[PDB]
Design a protein around this motif. Structure first.
Motif, mmCIF file in Angstrom:
data_model
loop_
_atom_site.group_PDB
_atom_site.id
_atom_site.type_symbol
_atom_site.label_atom_id
_atom_site.label_comp_id
_atom_site.label_asym_id
_atom_site.label_seq_id
_atom_site.Cartn_x
_atom_site.Cartn_y
_atom_site.Cartn_z
ATOM 1 N N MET A 28 0.826 -1.206 0.000
ATOM 2 C CA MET A 28 0.000 0.000 0.000
ATOM 3 C C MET A 28 0.862 1.258 0.000
ATOM 4 O O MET A 28 0.647 2.170 -0.811
ATOM 5 C CB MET A 28 -0.935 0.007 1.208
ATOM 6 C CG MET A 28 -2.273 -0.666 0.967
ATOM 7 S SD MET A 28 -3.450 -0.366 2.298
ATOM 8 C CE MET A 28 -2.735 -1.339 3.618
ATOM 9 N N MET A 29 1.853 1.317 0.894
ATOM 10 C CA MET A 29 2.719 2.493 0.953
ATOM 11 C C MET A 29 3.489 2.683 -0.346
ATOM 12 O O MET A 29 3.630 3.810 -0.828
ATOM 13 C CB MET A 29 3.693 2.386 2.122
ATOM 14 C CG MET A 29 3.032 2.345 3.474
ATOM 15 S SD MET A 29 4.209 2.486 4.827
ATOM 16 C CE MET A 29 5.204 1.017 4.596
ATOM 17 N N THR A 30 3.993 1.597 -0.927
ATOM 18 C CA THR A 30 4.775 1.714 -2.151
ATOM 19 C C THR A 30 3.905 2.106 -3.335
ATOM 20 O O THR A 30 4.378 2.790 -4.249
ATOM 21 C CB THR A 30 5.498 0.395 -2.422
ATOM 22 O OG1 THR A 30 6.503 0.191 -1.424
ATOM 23 C CG2 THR A 30 6.157 0.400 -3.784
ATOM 24 N N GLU A 31 2.640 1.684 -3.344
ATOM 25 C CA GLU A 31 1.739 2.063 -4.423
ATOM 26 C C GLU A 31 1.291 3.508 -4.290
ATOM 27 O O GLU A 31 0.986 4.154 -5.297
ATOM 28 C CB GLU A 31 0.528 1.133 -4.431
ATOM 29 C CG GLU A 31 -0.388 1.293 -5.628
ATOM 30 C CD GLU A 31 -1.520 0.287 -5.626
ATOM 31 O OE1 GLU A 31 -1.250 -0.914 -5.838
ATOM 32 O OE2 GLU A 31 -2.681 0.695 -5.410
ATOM 33 N N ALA A 32 1.234 4.030 -3.065
ATOM 34 C CA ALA A 32 0.848 5.426 -2.891
ATOM 35 C C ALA A 32 1.876 6.370 -3.507
ATOM 36 O O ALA A 32 1.509 7.383 -4.113
ATOM 37 C CB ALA A 32 0.659 5.735 -1.409
ATOM 38 N N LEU A 33 3.162 6.060 -3.362
ATOM 39 C CA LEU A 33 4.237 6.957 -3.769
ATOM 40 C C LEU A 33 4.650 6.807 -5.226
ATOM 41 O O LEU A 33 5.476 7.599 -5.688
ATOM 42 C CB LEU A 33 5.470 6.727 -2.892
ATOM 43 C CG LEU A 33 5.259 6.789 -1.381
ATOM 44 C CD1 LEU A 33 6.526 6.427 -0.638
ATOM 45 C CD2 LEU A 33 4.787 8.165 -0.974
ATOM 46 N N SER A 34 4.111 5.829 -5.959
ATOM 47 C CA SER A 34 4.550 5.521 -7.316
ATOM 48 C C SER A 34 3.397 5.588 -8.308
ATOM 49 O O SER A 34 3.438 4.933 -9.352
ATOM 50 C CB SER A 34 5.209 4.146 -7.372
ATOM 51 O OG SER A 34 4.280 3.127 -7.052
ATOM 52 N N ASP A 35 2.374 6.370 -8.008
ATOM 53 C CA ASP A 35 1.207 6.433 -8.878
ATOM 54 C C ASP A 35 1.476 7.418 -10.017
ATOM 55 O O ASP A 35 1.720 8.598 -9.750
ATOM 56 C CB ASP A 35 -0.017 6.862 -8.072
ATOM 57 C CG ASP A 35 -1.305 6.797 -8.871
ATOM 58 O OD1 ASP A 35 -1.268 6.427 -10.062
ATOM 59 O OD2 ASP A 35 -2.365 7.129 -8.302
ATOM 60 N N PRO A 36 1.458 6.984 -11.289
ATOM 61 C CA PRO A 36 1.776 7.937 -12.369
ATOM 62 C C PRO A 36 0.788 9.082 -12.489
ATOM 63 O O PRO A 36 1.147 10.140 -13.019
ATOM 64 C CB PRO A 36 1.772 7.065 -13.634
ATOM 65 C CG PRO A 36 1.759 5.669 -13.166
ATOM 66 C CD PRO A 36 1.086 5.672 -11.850
ATOM 67 N N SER A 37 -0.447 8.910 -12.010
ATOM 68 C CA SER A 37 -1.449 9.964 -12.147
ATOM 69 C C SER A 37 -1.098 11.194 -11.318
ATOM 70 O O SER A 37 -1.707 12.256 -11.486
ATOM 71 C CB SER A 37 -2.821 9.431 -11.735
ATOM 72 O OG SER A 37 -3.016 8.110 -12.207
ATOM 73 N N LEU A 38 -0.133 11.072 -10.405
ATOM 74 C CA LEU A 38 0.306 12.227 -9.630
ATOM 75 C C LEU A 38 1.188 13.145 -10.466
ATOM 76 O O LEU A 38 1.022 14.369 -10.445
ATOM 77 C CB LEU A 38 1.060 11.762 -8.383
ATOM 78 C CG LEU A 38 0.396 10.698 -7.505
ATOM 79 C CD1 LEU A 38 1.426 10.072 -6.580
ATOM 80 C CD2 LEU A 38 -0.762 11.287 -6.713
ATOM 81 N N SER A 39 2.144 12.569 -11.197
ATOM 82 C CA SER A 39 3.135 13.327 -11.953
ATOM 83 C C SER A 39 3.065 13.076 -13.448
ATOM 84 O O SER A 39 3.002 14.033 -14.225
ATOM 85 C CB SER A 39 4.544 12.990 -11.446
ATOM 86 O OG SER A 39 5.523 13.301 -12.421
ATOM 87 N N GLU A 40 3.087 11.811 -13.875
ATOM 88 C CA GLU A 40 3.324 11.503 -15.283
ATOM 89 C C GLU A 40 2.208 12.037 -16.172
ATOM 90 O O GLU A 40 2.470 12.589 -17.246
ATOM 91 C CB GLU A 40 3.485 9.994 -15.459
ATOM 92 N N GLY A 41 0.959 11.888 -15.741
ATOM 93 C CA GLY A 41 -0.165 12.404 -16.495
ATOM 94 C C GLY A 41 -0.434 13.867 -16.214
ATOM 95 O O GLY A 41 -1.408 14.199 -15.532
ATOM 96 N N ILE A 42 0.417 14.755 -16.729
ATOM 97 C CA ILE A 42 0.238 16.189 -16.521
ATOM 98 C C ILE A 42 -0.882 16.645 -17.444
ATOM 99 O O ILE A 42 -1.913 17.146 -16.982
ATOM 100 C CB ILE A 42 1.541 16.975 -16.778
#
Lengths: 55, 55, 55
Positions: A28-42
């Motif tokens: 869960m913690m590792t998936e929270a910090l590596s979600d592309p929708s936070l950064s990659e999908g600008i």
């Protein structure tokens, strides 16, 4: 018999349940910090046609 | 795609417990059927003892 | 075209919560339908016990 009294099967199953629960939490913690929708999908804009035109 | 490790582990354990209970229940149903058959045979025998003249 | 990052994040979270609640509700509706079926079968059995002469 003394050895099996020291480390029973109940303690073994408790240990493995703890291992699986901590694996779930770490995932869960590792998936929270590596979600592309936070950064990659600008830009989610529909320039797929436009980048097709640039290609 | 998050893996729920503990969830799947407990799912396997509960499935095994349900399989054990269902198997013992099926054994008991078979035993009940056999006991019913034996009761019917005993009633037939009682009828023959009545007809033959042996109360 | 302003991106609302937090808005979209919370939108995904609320959509997942609604999906979980809807899935559990659908499971409960299926269980209710099965229980209704079982009740109808029990009423049919009660009617047969009444007709056969077994109160």
């Amino acid at each position: 018999g003394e050895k099996i009294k020291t480390v029973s099967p109940e303690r073994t199953e408790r240990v493995m349940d703890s291992v699986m629960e901590q694996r779930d939490q770490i995932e869960m913690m590792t998936e929270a910090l590596s979600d592309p929708s936070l950064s990659e999908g600008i830009l989610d804009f529909e320039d797929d046609a436009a980048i097709d035109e640039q290609l | 795609m998050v893996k729920n490790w503990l969830f799947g582990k407990k799912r396997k354990e509960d499935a095994d417990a349900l399989a054990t209970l269902k198997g013992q229940q099926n054994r008991l149903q078979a035993e009940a059927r056999n006991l019913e058959r034996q009761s019917d045979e005993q009633k037939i025998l009682a009828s023959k003892m009545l007809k033959a003249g042996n109360k």
